Amino acid sequence: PWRHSGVNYNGSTLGPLEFEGDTAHQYRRDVFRPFFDEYLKPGSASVHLPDAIIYNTGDQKWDYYRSWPSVCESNCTGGLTPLYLADGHGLSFTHPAADGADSYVSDPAHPVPFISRPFAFAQSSRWKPWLVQDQREAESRPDVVTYETEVLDEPVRVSGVPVADLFAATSGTDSDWVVKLIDVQPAMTPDDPKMGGYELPVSMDIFRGRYRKDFAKP
Amino acid sequence: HDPLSVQTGSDIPASVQQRDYIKREVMVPMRDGVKLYTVIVIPKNARNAPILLTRTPYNAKGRANRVPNALTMREVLPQGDDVFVEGGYIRVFQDIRGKYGSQGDYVMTRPPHGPLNPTKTDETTDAWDTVDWLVHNVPESNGRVGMTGSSAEGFTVVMALLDPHPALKVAAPESPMVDGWMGDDWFHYGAFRQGAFDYFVSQMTARGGGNDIPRRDADDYTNFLKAGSAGSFATQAGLDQYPFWQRMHAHPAYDAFWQGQALDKILAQRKPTVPMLWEQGLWDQEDMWGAIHAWQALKDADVKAPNTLVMGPWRHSGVNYNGSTLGPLEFEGDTAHQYRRDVFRPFFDEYLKPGSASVHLPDAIIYNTGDQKWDYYRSWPSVCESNCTGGLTPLYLADGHGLSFTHPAADGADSYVSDPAHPVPFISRPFAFAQSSRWKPWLVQDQREAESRPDVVTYETEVLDEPVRVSGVPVADLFAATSGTDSDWVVKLIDVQPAMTPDDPKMGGYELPVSMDIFRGRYRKDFAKPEALQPDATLHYHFTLPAVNHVFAKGHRIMVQIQSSWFPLYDRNPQKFVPNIFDAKPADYTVATQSIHHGGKEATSILLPVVK
Amino acid sequence: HDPLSVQTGSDIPASVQQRDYIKREVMVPMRDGVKLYTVIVIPKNARNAPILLTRTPYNAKGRANRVPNALTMREVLPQGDDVFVEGGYIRVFQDIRGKYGSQGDYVMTRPPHGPLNPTKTDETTDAWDTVDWLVHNVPESNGRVGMTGSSAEGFTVVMALLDPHPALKVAAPESPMVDGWMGDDWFHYGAFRQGAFDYFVSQMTARGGGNDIPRRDADDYTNFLKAGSAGSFATQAGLDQYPFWQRMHAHPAYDAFWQGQALDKILAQRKPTVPMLWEQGLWDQEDMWGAIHAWQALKDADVKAPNTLVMGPWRHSGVNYNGSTLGPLEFEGDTAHQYRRDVFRPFFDEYLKPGSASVHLPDAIIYNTGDQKWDYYRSWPSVCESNCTGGLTPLYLADGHGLSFTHPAADGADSYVSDPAHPVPFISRPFAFAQSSRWKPWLVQDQREAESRPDVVTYETEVLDEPVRVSGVPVADLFAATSGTDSDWVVKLIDVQPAMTPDDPKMGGYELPVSMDIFRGRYRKDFAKPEALQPDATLHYHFTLPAVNHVFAKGHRIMVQIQSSWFPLYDRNPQKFVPNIFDAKPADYTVATQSIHHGGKEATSILLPVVK
């Protein structure tokens, strides 16, 4: 649960998020060092590492997966589960038969800030934990469309690479498509009040529309 | 049995000289038999001392207990009482009718005797009976009473000024509740302030203390948006059983209910002879209309008594605390203490302490938010719409999102889509009304967030080569059109800081608002008779904005920002004409295209009070 | 008249579904007719649900209202109830006899039935009647009650364990008040804790809330020093009229009054059969004696029930909050939540939720303050004074202010002047008892300030080449001399951090105390019969210090600090034998020369619980 190069520093926090101890030092001591010792120090203990060792941003613990990922598009034990966008700005696991569409105006004279203004690239302290910043500012804008499920009654576990299956239209001849997968914290978090309703992005990216068909031939 | 070992009774003692003050608790009887809880703080060995009186609905016992049962009077009394404690004044805090230790019925901002109050008592008589009692029952006093207080405590001062007792020699209302509809606590040109619900429940649930409205989400932007309309929130909060809300809900327009409560107009018709010192902050987020309008009305009515207006770089009630800062802004020392020691105290001493020096205060003493110093204006304002030495200078909106002092003869217009499903946050999300630390300095926050939104139109001058000085009331001369049948118009006058401020880096390019307000379109023609707007027609809006005493320095920029929402502070305008916005239904909220015309016959501008 | 415009009544309403819980307020009648206010928080539509009960003198109504009248149960209940809210437990908070909403007489830490309480009731019977009522009157419950609580709420659990109701299936006292004289809230080996005065006035002024003692100065070091003695401050604060103080003032020694209140000795004689989970923090600044001594006494008496001791890296009551940090220290995640989720909850589920997984807890579960991990000890402690697998390893004080594991045959002694006019501050000045943020993590503060003083002797080992692991109770074997006839002895076991800690620069050379306590010299021979000390004679002092589960890593240093004052937390020892230190006179305070002998026959050392 680190930022770029965060593995060489302290892994206890990242922005307002708090993890179970110094996760970076944990990896350095429990995995990194012993793995290196096996081949660099003759006579050292043999370590048998799995396919992947990933920290669980929900369970708050290290997960050791013998085979990872267990689910994906093709050549995996199982496929991906589609979380469909629905009517009334909702999200459902049930495929909605009815056709529908939502519109938003994209004005380049007023682009959406990736993080709160003001921001300068020299501000390292703001740049580092940018990916965990609250997305509530974007949601309040008419140039950002937001979809969400109902307050969960049962937990939903995700482990792998999420794929954006987007069916979008533009009135122009080019366009960028930013898709954010967000984990909305409980409406109220009394043990840490500032996290109430916090829109934490667990995964997000941008796609330049001109490369839809070919990445080499726009 | 041994009492020093075996306890068969209670450990709580049956009954429970080091202080420099004496605290007296009395129940002062009014003319109708109702008694009012009064706390009198008299300094030890005090003889022939003046009385500083404050009537309050915020717990008199608590107010005179900053540090509960402290050893010193300085500790026991509020920070704002510092200069009076040093002066040996007798402090008096009294619970108003129907609140805390007081008896009787409580009426939120009780209307003065008239069509809205046919009984023999009101806040005016309550103050009269109080003063009359204090001058006959406090032997340590010289029989001279001075009145002060901020917010609702300021409201009581204004009420007492309608018909004061001869012993009330001086008064100083601080950011008082004068007109809750025009521009104070409840509405701002018709636009309802949603933070009122929490105030209602906290002040009217019981005689004593009350609790806040439990929330679903931590964000009030989310809370009020999910509820829909303001009325819907109120109903969900169980506010429908509260008599004051029932009256407000029935009177959304500026009718007889609100007109009969406008203290600025009433006080001016009575012609008081008691020296006054009106005060409000330049960034008063709760009572911007209060002081300035009451002071101006008295000046226009040719009052025969000292009438001075004081405006510092403070937030609501900031005059009683530390005025060194406000949000990220820094001023030249403790401006609040400065005013309290140099102006407030001596002015009160003149009428409450016989033999004291005579002070000759000017028309207004306003701090300069540009020059960083106190300005003393013998005649203020020097420029305004009519009946002034000079007129206002129009700062025209122009082509290419610009601002100029030169009239653009050609027509032009810029558009923005106002979607009520995504209203513009008044301050960064998340925000809850319970977060006092964010609410207090809201008026000085950077407006760069709003500038980046497509539903907010921004205009700016070039980087200034010569400073532009403004002192007075700016007037928004707006020529706007909407596709809907109703709309809200938010206009902001901003002072953009230099692109780079190397001594304080975070201030570089900061969009500091010096004055901003909202106007509910339905009240364009008449405030008392709301009417629908013509779709797509460019209409003329003319309204005054909060006063200014600023200097847009070299390297700065003057900026104007226009939008149609300010959530969740102001309830969303459905953008469709409905009889009562409070009861707007989900289907009433319409997306609308707003057009701000510039140049030609419909040249939108900000009528600036430019001075030499 | 129009009611929607004219109000002649009150704006306060005569009588003032969205929640996931139901709150029930009941007055539970005890065996003597006295009713106790009980708040029952029940989750919406629950059946066969266990009850978590807490009896408290800290306002039940408030405790069950973390976020007053909140929409969710999670919000409404304290942080420490998180796992029980997730488990669907029924929360029950009750006001103990004589406090807040409860009737009857209030007796501070009411003694159990015996020579100090000849009535028909006590805290044991009150809990019995409460459990009996709860299991018959709450239809949503499965008739199984679990008891928990911290501080005074922990005291009520221990009291209930003396003779529990059949329905009380499990108990978990957290940092309970077991022995106020030995090492809990009031005294520590006879040394009086001056913070008790504020606690006395805040809890025994009235049935409900009370206020703090008004201070003259902001610094309590100044306040107490100026007052002179502890009894002198009490008199000046008007505490002489408080019955509990009157008894304490009459019983400064460990006589029948304190012996008959030692819950560890009483509980071990009763032999309970209810599964227990004892808890206290390794840095418990309010109740260090409590849990460990109560758990150990039961273990020695061969208790026929699960008896586990849990000690985390927490301050007093820190188990119910966030255990990630403590002062400048950082632990491996939220240790408090970890314990609550992995140990606490499942242990309670085993006896309260029929069908749940069975847990087999070891002797003790202690967090390692060196290894930064949870240690599970099947048998604890493995090393101690007598009746253990191994003995303690002595860490001898040596020449040139050093420490060694090798016994020095050569005799030696180091001296320091203890001047009562200038007592050693327990933590940096200024400090007031009201400053909670400084009081809570005081036990982990840097001891470098003390080391720099001439009235504090310091001993340290060389920079460690190999780690030294310690697990158990360290025993101070001190051979000290004083020129006076009385004296206090403060012994600190410190873990000096590496000279430089590049990953966290501020920790470089930091003198972190892993265990420290004070011993009032007059009680050297007998705790019940105080005696004067022979001037200039080296006497033997033998006392246990707070438990440890640390590892002095490579680069670190083990350090011992010895002083004779710990102001203003502990009252100053006059250093002259007086019948009652509480009533010491100004002339009694004598400057004394203290000598700590090392080597030979009087080899001062800290008997460390060194493990492999």
XYZ file of N, CA and C in Angstrom, chain B residues 221-315:
285
model
N -23.190 18.500 2.096
C -23.433 18.742 0.680
C -24.283 17.545 0.262
N -23.846 16.361 0.686
C -24.516 15.097 0.404
C -25.867 15.021 1.114
N -25.882 15.400 2.390
C -27.079 15.384 3.224
C -28.246 16.202 2.695
N -27.969 17.450 2.338
C -28.998 18.335 1.821
C -29.407 18.016 0.386
N -28.484 17.443 -0.384
C -28.761 17.085 -1.771
C -29.654 15.853 -1.839
N -29.414 14.904 -0.936
C -30.190 13.672 -0.876
C -31.612 13.961 -0.401
N -31.737 14.913 0.520
C -33.034 15.302 1.059
C -33.870 15.991 -0.020
N -33.198 16.755 -0.880
C -33.848 17.473 -1.962
C -33.984 18.957 -1.667
N -35.149 19.341 -1.158
C -35.420 20.733 -0.827
C -35.135 20.997 0.645
N -35.080 22.277 1.006
C -34.821 22.688 2.384
C -35.943 22.210 3.293
N -37.179 22.326 2.810
C -38.357 21.912 3.554
C -38.365 20.422 3.830
N -37.885 19.656 2.856
C -37.806 18.205 2.949
C -36.829 17.793 4.052
N -35.752 18.558 4.213
C -34.753 18.281 5.240
C -35.394 18.560 6.595
N -36.050 19.715 6.690
C -36.732 20.164 7.900
C -37.732 19.132 8.401
N -38.522 18.593 7.473
C -39.535 17.587 7.775
C -38.850 16.325 8.288
N -37.763 15.944 7.621
C -36.997 14.762 7.994
C -36.312 14.960 9.342
N -36.008 16.213 9.674
C -35.352 16.554 10.936
C -36.352 16.749 12.070
N -37.639 16.718 11.732
C -38.700 16.886 12.709
C -38.893 18.333 13.110
N -38.556 19.243 12.199
C -38.685 20.675 12.445
C -40.083 21.232 12.199
N -40.973 20.392 11.679
C -42.343 20.795 11.390
C -43.171 21.102 12.632
N -42.677 20.674 13.789
C -43.364 20.904 15.054
C -42.865 22.182 15.733
N -41.848 22.810 15.147
C -41.269 24.042 15.685
C -42.003 25.274 15.149
N -42.693 25.995 16.031
C -43.451 27.197 15.657
C -42.707 28.252 14.841
N -41.436 28.518 15.129
C -40.709 29.522 14.359
C -40.492 29.113 12.906
N -40.253 27.824 12.677
C -40.037 27.325 11.325
C -41.349 27.382 10.543
N -42.452 27.096 11.232
C -43.782 27.110 10.637
C -44.114 28.489 10.086
N -43.652 29.522 10.783
C -43.887 30.902 10.373
C -42.980 31.265 9.206
N -41.729 30.813 9.262
C -40.756 31.081 8.206
C -41.168 30.372 6.920
N -41.649 29.141 7.073
C -42.097 28.314 5.956
C -43.286 28.966 5.242
N -44.123 29.666 6.003
C -45.296 30.338 5.450
C -44.964 31.702 4.848
N -43.793 32.235 5.186
C -43.380 33.536 4.669
C -42.028 33.511 3.955
N -41.962 32.946 2.749
C -40.697 32.891 2.005
C -40.303 34.232 1.389
N -41.286 35.076 1.090
C -41.038 36.385 0.498
C -40.968 37.472 1.566
N -40.460 38.639 1.180
C -40.325 39.779 2.079
C -41.675 40.470 2.304
N -42.611 39.770 2.943
C -43.932 40.337 3.208
C -43.993 41.088 4.538
N -45.205 41.289 5.050
C -45.428 41.993 6.311
C -44.714 41.381 7.517
N -44.540 40.062 7.499
C -43.877 39.336 8.579
C -42.407 39.730 8.720
N -41.735 39.925 7.589
C -40.330 40.305 7.594
C -40.123 41.817 7.627
N -40.980 42.546 6.916
C -40.902 44.003 6.855
C -41.110 44.625 8.229
N -41.997 44.021 9.015
C -42.294 44.497 10.353
C -41.212 44.114 11.345
N -40.203 43.390 10.864
C -39.088 42.942 11.692
C -37.754 43.571 11.289
N -37.785 44.414 10.260
C -36.586 45.092 9.776
C -36.216 46.189 10.771
N -35.265 45.877 11.648
C -34.806 46.809 12.676
C -34.135 48.100 12.212
N -33.582 48.108 11.002
C -32.920 49.300 10.480
C -33.928 50.398 10.153
N -35.062 49.995 9.590
C -36.126 50.916 9.215
C -36.881 51.414 10.438
N -37.121 50.514 11.387
C -37.841 50.858 12.609
C -37.055 51.823 13.497
N -35.786 51.507 13.750
C -34.928 52.346 14.581
C -34.765 53.759 14.018
N -34.721 53.871 12.693
C -34.571 55.159 12.022
C -35.816 56.042 12.158
N -36.973 55.404 12.308
C -38.249 56.101 12.454
C -38.480 56.594 13.883
N -37.759 56.013 14.840
C -37.885 56.383 16.248
C -36.999 57.550 16.672
N -35.915 57.762 15.928
C -34.950 58.835 16.185
C -34.378 58.829 17.608
N -33.459 57.906 17.890
C -32.845 57.811 19.219
C -31.797 58.898 19.440
N -31.529 59.221 20.703
C -30.546 60.247 21.051
C -29.363 59.682 21.832
N -29.280 58.356 21.884
C -28.208 57.656 22.587
C -27.031 57.409 21.642
N -25.839 57.861 22.032
C -24.626 57.680 21.223
C -24.450 56.215 20.840
N -24.240 55.954 19.552
C -24.069 54.593 19.065
C -22.740 54.341 18.376
N -22.324 53.081 18.429
C -21.086 52.621 17.825
C -21.447 51.295 17.170
N -21.745 51.342 15.875
C -22.108 50.143 15.126
C -20.859 49.399 14.683
N -20.906 48.073 14.760
C -19.771 47.244 14.372
C -20.175 45.934 13.702
N -19.356 45.518 12.742
C -19.534 44.282 11.990
C -18.200 44.041 11.302
N -17.903 42.789 10.984
C -16.652 42.478 10.321
C -16.787 42.679 8.826
N -15.658 42.856 8.145
C -15.670 43.046 6.698
C -16.014 41.712 6.049
N -15.716 40.638 6.774
C -15.979 39.282 6.319
C -16.962 38.592 7.263
N -18.044 39.294 7.586
C -19.083 38.783 8.476
C -19.954 37.752 7.763
N -19.665 36.482 8.017
C -20.392 35.377 7.411
C -21.790 35.074 7.963
N -22.200 35.782 9.011
C -23.517 35.552 9.603
C -24.457 36.755 9.593
N -23.901 37.949 9.787
C -24.699 39.169 9.807
C -24.049 40.322 9.048
N -24.019 40.199 7.725
C -23.432 41.201 6.842
C -24.303 42.450 6.654
N -25.619 42.276 6.708
C -26.560 43.379 6.532
C -26.684 44.301 7.741
N -26.813 43.683 8.911
C -26.959 44.338 10.200
C -26.501 45.753 10.502
N -25.249 45.871 10.939
C -24.639 47.148 11.299
C -24.646 48.254 10.254
N -24.073 47.971 9.087
C -23.998 48.937 7.993
C -25.340 49.550 7.581
N -26.368 48.720 7.430
C -27.677 49.224 7.038
C -28.385 50.002 8.139
N -28.175 49.595 9.387
C -28.795 50.274 10.521
C -28.136 51.632 10.724
N -26.815 51.663 10.566
C -26.026 52.881 10.718
C -26.347 53.887 9.611
N -26.454 53.390 8.380
C -26.758 54.211 7.209
C -28.156 54.820 7.286
N -29.124 54.022 7.734
C -30.507 54.476 7.861
C -30.614 55.613 8.867
N -29.827 55.532 9.936
C -29.832 56.563 10.968
C -29.166 57.833 10.448
N -28.154 57.659 9.602
C -27.426 58.778 9.014
C -28.330 59.504 8.022
N -29.140 58.741 7.290
C -30.066 59.296 6.304
C -31.238 60.000 6.986
N -31.596 59.534 8.181
C -32.699 60.119 8.940
C -32.248 61.325 9.763
N -30.966 61.671 9.636
C -30.346 62.792 10.341
C -30.427 62.651 11.860
N -29.845 61.567 12.366
C -29.826 61.274 13.796
C -29.084 62.357 14.584
N -29.651 62.749 15.721
C -29.048 63.775 16.564
C -28.248 63.156 17.711
N -27.312 62.282 17.357
C -26.462 61.598 18.329
C -25.277 60.983 17.595
N -24.154 60.782 18.286
C -22.966 60.181 17.662
C -23.319 58.851 17.002
N -23.051 58.743 15.705
C -23.340 57.538 14.934
C -22.115 57.111 14.130
N -21.317 56.218 14.706
C -20.106 55.731 14.050
C -20.158 54.244 13.713
N -19.649 53.902 12.532
C -19.614 52.521 12.066
C -18.171 52.020 12.056
N -17.934 50.866 12.672
C -16.590 50.299 12.717
C -16.569 48.939 12.034
N -15.663 48.779 11.073
C -15.537 47.523 10.349
C -14.079 47.089 10.272
N -13.771 45.969 10.918
C -12.420 45.438 10.926
C -12.303 44.225 10.022
N -11.107 43.651 9.944
C -10.866 42.473 9.105
C -11.189 41.227 9.925
N -12.439 41.141 10.367
C -12.885 40.021 11.178
C -14.057 39.237 10.609
N -14.293 38.080 11.214
C -15.385 37.202 10.828
C -16.509 37.581 11.790
